[PDB]
Every structure is written in C-alpha cells, then in structure tokens.
Amino acid sequence: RSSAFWRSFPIFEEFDSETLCELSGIASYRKWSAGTVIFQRGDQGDYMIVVVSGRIKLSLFTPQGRELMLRQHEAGALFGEMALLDGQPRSADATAVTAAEGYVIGKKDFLALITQRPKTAEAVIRFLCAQLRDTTDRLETIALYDLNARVARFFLATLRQIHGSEMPQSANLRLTLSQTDIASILGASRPKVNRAILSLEESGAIKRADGIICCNVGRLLSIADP
Amino acid sequence: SAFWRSFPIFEEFDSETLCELSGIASYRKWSAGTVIFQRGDQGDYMIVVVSGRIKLSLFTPQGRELMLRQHEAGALFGEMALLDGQPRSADATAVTAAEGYVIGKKDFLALITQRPKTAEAVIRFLCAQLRDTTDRLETIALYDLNARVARFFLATLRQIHGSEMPQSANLRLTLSQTDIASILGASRPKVNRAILSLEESGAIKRADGIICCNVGRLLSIADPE
DNA sequence: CTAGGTAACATTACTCG
DNA sequence: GCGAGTAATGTTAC
DNA sequence: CTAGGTAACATTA
DNA sequence: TAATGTTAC
Ligand SMILES: Nc1ncnc2c1ncn2[C@@H]1O[C@@H]2COP(=O)(O)O[C@H]2[C@H]1O
Ligand SMILES: Nc1ncnc2c1ncn2[C@@H]1O[C@@H]2COP(=O)(O)O[C@H]2[C@H]1O
Ligand SMILES: [Mg+2]
Ligand SMILES: [Mg+2]
Numbered sequence: 001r002s003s004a005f006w007r008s009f010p011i012f013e014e015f016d017s018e019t020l021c022e023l024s025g026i027a028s029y030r031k032w033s034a035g036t037v038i039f040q041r042g043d044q045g046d047y048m049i050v051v052v053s054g055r056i057k058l059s060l061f062t063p064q065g066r067e068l069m070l071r072q073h074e075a076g077a078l079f080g081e082m083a084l085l086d087g088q089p090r091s092a093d094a095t096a097v098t099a100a101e102g103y104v105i106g107k108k109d110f111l112a113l114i115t116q117r118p119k120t121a122e123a124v125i126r127f128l129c130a131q132l133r134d135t136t137d138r139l140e141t142i143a144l145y146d147l148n149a150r151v152a153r154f155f156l157a158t159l160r161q162i163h164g165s166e167m168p169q170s171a172n173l174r175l176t177l178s179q180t181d182i183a184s185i186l187g188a189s190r191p192k193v194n195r196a197i198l199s200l201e202e203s204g205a206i207k208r209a210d211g212i213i214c215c216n217v218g219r220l221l222s223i224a225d226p
Numbered sequence: 227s228a229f230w231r232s233f234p235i236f237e238e239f240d241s242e243t244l245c246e247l248s249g250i251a252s253y254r255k256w257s258a259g260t261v262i263f264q265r266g267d268q269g270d271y272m273i274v275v276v277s278g279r280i281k282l283s284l285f286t287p288q289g290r291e292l293m294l295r296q297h298e299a300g301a302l303f304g305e306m307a308l309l310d311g312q313p314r315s316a317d318a319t320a321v322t323a324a325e326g327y328v329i330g331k332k333d334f335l336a337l338i339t340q341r342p343k344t345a346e347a348v349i350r351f352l353c354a355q356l357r358d359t360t361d362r363l364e365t366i367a368l369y370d371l372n373a374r375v376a377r378f379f380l381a382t383l384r385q386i387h388g389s390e391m392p393q394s395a396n397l398r399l400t401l402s403q404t405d406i407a408s409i410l411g412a413s414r415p416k417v418n419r420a421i422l423s424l425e426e427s428g429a430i431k432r433a434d435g436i437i438c439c440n441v442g443r444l445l446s447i448a449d450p451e
Numbered sequence: 452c453t454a455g456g457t458a459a460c461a462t463t464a465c466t467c468g
Numbered sequence: 469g470c471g472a473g474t475a476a477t478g479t480t481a482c
Numbered sequence: 483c484t485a486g487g488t489a490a491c492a493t494t495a
Numbered sequence: 496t497a498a499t500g501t502t503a504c
Contacts, residue, residue: 060360064450066368070360086353091360118342121349128352129310135356136284136294136315139363143411144290147486178498187367189487194500210495226288370454402476413456418478434464 001052001103009050010078014123019113026110027103032056032096041093045083046107051075054100055176058092059184069184072097072177084110085124142187145224150186151196152205152224155215172214233274234302238347247337251327256280256320265317269307270331275299278324279400282316283408293408296321296401308334309348366411369448374410375420376429376448379439396438 002024007013012020027050032038038056039045049056051073058079060068070092073079083090084107114121141153159171177185183193200206205220206213227245231237236244251274256262262280263269273280275297282303284292294316297303307314308331338345365377383395401409407417424430429444430437 060364060368062364062368062449064368068364068367082353082356085349086357088353088357091357115343115346118345119339121342121345122339125309125345125349125352128349128356129306129312132306132352132356132359133310133312133315135359135363139359139366140284140286140292142363142367143292144284144286144288180498187363190499191488191501192486198500403478404476414477415457415479416455422478 008076010076011081011123011127012050012078014126015120016117019117019120023113024103026105026113029101030104031099031101034096034099036096038094038096039080039090041090043090045080045090047104048078048080048084048107048110049094049102049104051077051079051100051102053102054096055098056100056102057095057097059095060092067184068187069181072181074176081124147186147188147192147196148199149224150188151182151193151200152220154182154186155200155206155213156217156220156224159215159217167217169218170214170216172212174211175213232300234300235305235347235351236274236302238350239344240341243337243341243344247340248329250329250333250337253325254328255323255325258320258323260320262318262320263304263314265314267314269304269314271328272302272304272308272331272334273318273326273328275301275303275324275326277326278320279322280324280326281319281321283319284316291408292411293405296405298400305348371410371412371416371420372423373448374412375406375417375424376444378406378410379424379430379437380441380444380448383439383441391441393442394438394440396436398435399437 002021004021006020006023007015012023015023032054034054038049041060052075054074056073056077056079058070058073060070071077071079079094080090082088114124137157141150145153155173158175159167159173162173163171179194179197180190182197183190186193188196197206197208200220200223201208203223204216205223206215227248230244230248231239236248254273256278258278262273265284276299278298280297280301280303282294282297284294295301295303303318304314306312338348361381365374369377379397382399383397384391386397387395403418403421404414406421407414410417412420421430421432424444424447425432427443427447428440429447430439
C-alpha cells in the first residue's frame with residue numbers, strides 16, 4: 001500500500017507527488033484488537049497514526065467518569081498529529097472500538113519532511129484551520145442551541161462530511177454510529193438524544209430505515225434554527 | 227523593532243523577517259463601541275492590538291452571544307481567513323477605544339512562503355488554539371457551572387503563570403461577570419451565584435479588581451471527590 | 452429531579468461635561 | 469464638585 | 483419555570 | 496446480547 005494511496009488521507013492529499021509516493025517511505029504497519037487503547041490523553045506522542053481498516057474513537061475522559069467522543073475515525077483518517085507538531089502531550093484518548101489496522105509515522109521523519117519540502121507546511125496549516133473551525137462550530141452548537149437543534153446540526157454537518165459545496169434536498173445517509181455515540185458527541189444523555197431523534201422523525205425532518213436515514217435538508221435547517 | 231516580538235506567532239521569528247519585513251503594518255483605530263468586521267465578512271487582513279479591548283464573539287440569529295475572547299495589547303486576531311480562503315469565523319467588536327496595526331493577506335503570505343520556518347511558528351500557534359478550544363468544549367460539555375467557572379480561573383492563571391502554578395495567586399481579571407457568563411456559555415445570575423459559591427467555599431476572595439485564587443481547592447472544585 | 456434560563460427588581464460603582 | 473448616563477453586582481420568582 | 487440528566491424498565495433484530 | 500424506546504422524577 002503505497003500509491004496514489006497516500007492521497008486518500010487528509011493533509012497528505014494536497015501533496016506534490018515527490019514527497020507523497022516516496023512517503024510510504026516512513027510508515028510502519030500496526031494493528032489493534034477490538035476494544036483496546038492505542039494511547040491515553042496523558043501520553044507522549046512522537047508518532048502519528050493513519051487509519052487503513054477499522055473504527056477508532058478519539059475521546060476526552062474526565063476524572064468524574066464522563067466522556068466526550070471527539071471523533072469516530074475509519075479508513076482514510078489521520079490522527080495524533082498535534083503532539084507531533086507541537087511539543088505538547090496528547091490532547092485526547094484513542095481507543096480502538098473494533099479491530100483496526102493503520103500505519104504509524106515518526107516525529108523526526110515527519111517533521112524533517114515538512115521542513116524539507118516546505119509548501120507541505122501549507123497543507124498542514126489548511127488542515128489545522130479546518131479543525132479549528134470544525135471545533136468552534138461544535139462549541140457554538142453545544143452552547144447556543146437546544147438538543148433538537150444540536151442533533152439537527154450534527155446531521156447537517158455530517159451531510160457535509162459527504163456532499164459539501166452544497167447540498168441537495170433529500171439525501172440518504174449511512175450513519176454508522178449508535179445513539180450512544182451521538183449522545184457522546186453532542187455532550188448529552190442517551191434517552192434525551194433518542195427522544196430528540198424520534199422528534200426529528202415525527203416532525204418530518206428525517207426517516208430511519210435500517211442503517212439509512214433519508215434526511216430532509218431544510219426541513220432540517222430550520223429545526224437547526226428558529 | 228523587538229516590539230514585533232510581543233505578539234503571538236510573530237514572537238518566535240528570526241530577527242530578519244521580524245524587524246523588517248513587517249514593513250507591512252498600517253495604523254488603524256476604532257472608537258469605543260463599534261465593529262471592525264462581522265462574521266459573514268471577507269478577511270484579507272489580520273489585526274494586531276496595540277491599545278484597547280476588542281471582543282471576538284459568535285452571534286446567533288436568535289440573538290445569543292458566545293464571547294470567544296477579550297483581546298488587549300499584545301494580541302493577534304483575524305489570521306484564519308488569511309491563511310485559509312474562508313470567510314471570517316467570528317465577529318470583532320471594539321468594546322473600548324482601540325488602536326492596532328493591520329497586515330495584508332498578500333504581504334503576510336508572501337512572507338510565510340519566503341522564510342518558511344515561520345510557517346512552523348504559525349502551526350505551533352494553530353495547534354495551541356485547537357487545544358485551547360477543545361478544552362473549552364470539554365469544559366462546557368462535561369462539567370457543571372461551578373467547575374466551569376473554576377476551570378476558567380485556572381486557565382487564565384495558567385496563562386499568566388503556566389509551567390509552575392503556585393499556591394495562592396492574585397489575579398487582575400478585567401472582565402465583568404456578564405463577560406464571564408458570555409464566555410462560559412451560561413447566564414449572568416447563575417454565573418454570579420457560582421462565583422460567590424467559590425468564594426463562600428474558600429476557593430477565592432474578591433477585593434476590588436483583584437481575586438486571590440486558591441489553586442487547588444480550586445482544582446477539586448474544578449473536579450470531584 | 453435538578454441545574455440552569457429568563458424577566459424583573461433593587462442596590463453599589465464607574466465615569467464624564 | 470457635581471448631576472445625568474450608563475454599567476456592574478446580587479437576588480428573587482417563576 | 484423547564485430543558486435536559488438519571489436510574490430504571492420495556493420492546494426489538 | 497446489544498440497540499432502541501419509554502417513564503417517573
Ligand atoms: N478538536 C479536535 N478535532 C479533531 N481531532 C482532534 C481534536 N483534538 C485532538 N484531536 C486529535 O486527537 C489527537 C490526540 O493526540 P494528539 O493531541 O497528539 O493529536 C490529536 C488530534 O489528532
Ligand atoms: N476558538 C477560537 N479561539 C480564539 N480565537 C478565535 C477562535 N476562533 C476564531 N478566533 C479568532 O476570531 C477571528 C475571527 O476572524 P478570523 O476567522 O479571520 O480569525 C479569527 C481568530 O483570530
Ligand atoms: Mg456542529
Ligand atoms: Mg475553560
């Protein structure tokens with residue numbers, strides 16, 4: 001696995017072909033059984049992971065016991081890069097939820113590659129900006145809106161993780177997350193997330209067949225609003 | 227021109243690009259109570275604050291406000307829509323009479339791509355922000371209001387100190403409780419009774435303008451047991 | 452069942468010709 | 469040395 | 483005053 | 496067995 005295969009992942013897309021193909025120069029394989037830790041939020045991160053198979057959850061856990069699911073990453077995802085670029089410890093907790101395999105990249109190699117072909121820095125920056133926006137809109141979502149709108153804005157944001165650049169009218173969606181996973185992302189409780197999803201359905205915002213939600217984008221945008 | 231080292235991002239530069247090539251600020255000022263730019267807007271310019279207080283905030287159609295930051299001297303804002311083609315991501319309001327220096331998109335970026343280990347600086351900044359913002363998000367999501375206030379005081383104290391943390395540290399906070407309610411995504415009266423709560427529980431004491439925080443009582447109000 | 456939001460009212464505190 | 473314009477703080481009843 | 487949390491219980495593939 | 500739905504408070 002080293003073609004134009006490295007263009008599938010965020011950040012690494014957007015590279016010149018030289019650094020790219022030559023870039024499976026510095027991956028090692030690894031794998032993690034279903035239900036195990038890759039690393040913890042305390043930890044030292046001198047390696048960045050790139051996901052080939054499986055589902056890995058990035059989440060914040062609090063001493064009280066509470067969880068904020070930051071992301072569920074599957075094939076084509078990139079995580080663990082902040083503590084690479086920035087001297088700081090890991091900023092979240094990475095758990096394999098199902099049997100997963102990826103490729104790891106070292107700190108010294110990566111960074112040398114950045115500083116060697118420096119318009120790749122540019123790529124990485126456009127990524128961190130992207131994240132910062134994503135995260136601030138999450139924060140606004142959780143702060144200024146109620147739970148129905150929170151769920152609505154979650155569906156519209158993922159229906160931009162799929163379309164984006166703009167948006168039909170009725171779009172089916174394979175969501176792959178349980179409602180416990182949605183409760184964890186939205187910083188709410190399972191039963192109330194459930195009643196909210198059902199609410200969106202009974203109000204004509206969505207309908208749910210098994211694995212598939214046909215969302216009504218717009219019909220969903222004013223539930224997301226007033 | 228070691229004056230350009232006072233601001234985030236620009237600190238951390240080689241002296242060549244720093245004293246020079248910055249070369250590329252215009253003066254500008256904004257009266258107390260006015261808009262610099264709006265969240266819709268096109269941002270091809272980045273601001274660097276010399277005097278005054280400017281609030282960066284998100285406003286919703288419903289009318290609600292999330293204060294993202296109150297920046298004063300030594301602050302840098304408006305850089306995301308520079309680096310990234312996208313519109314402005316928040317709303318910048320001068321709360322008091324403010325003055326700054328503006329830097330254009332084309333100049334800035336040319337400077338990045340000309341001395342490329344400055345990119346490195348900028349990245350360490352965006353990482354910093356991303357962490358800051360995710361810890362905010364965790365704060366607002368997994369904790370109650372007393373802990374939210376507590377974690378706000380510790381974050382502003384780890385910004386003044388950081389890398390050390392004493393035991394009792396006084397703090398000049400400069401924000402009203404309405405400003406704290408707006409940052410924490412809560413309501414003024416409940417923020418007030420929370421602050422008072424921290425005081426009556428021995429976490430802080432408030433003299434006029436100054437809060438002597440007790441870092442550690444304050445850390446387990448920020449937590450459980 | 453509970454931590455908060457909202458409207459409304461009273462004081463203190465800045466502050467500016 | 470104000471008196472008139474604002475805020476900022478604290479509390480209470482929904 | 484009331485969204486939204488919590489503990490528990492039922493229906494479902 | 497896990498995923499979804501509901502209820503009382
Ligand atoms: N807000 C966020 N959005 C998406 N991914 C994040 C966020 N915060 C942290 N991460 C990822 O989680 C990783 C945890 O370890 P690092 O902090 O080394 O690198 C981090 C990022 O790759
Ligand atoms: N999470 C955040 N934390 C601090 N400042 C932010 C955040 N999001 C946006 N900003 C600032 O607000 C500015 C709004 O316009 P820009 O998006 O051009 O640049 C932005 C940043 O300077
Ligand atoms: Mg969102
Ligand atoms: Mg905080």
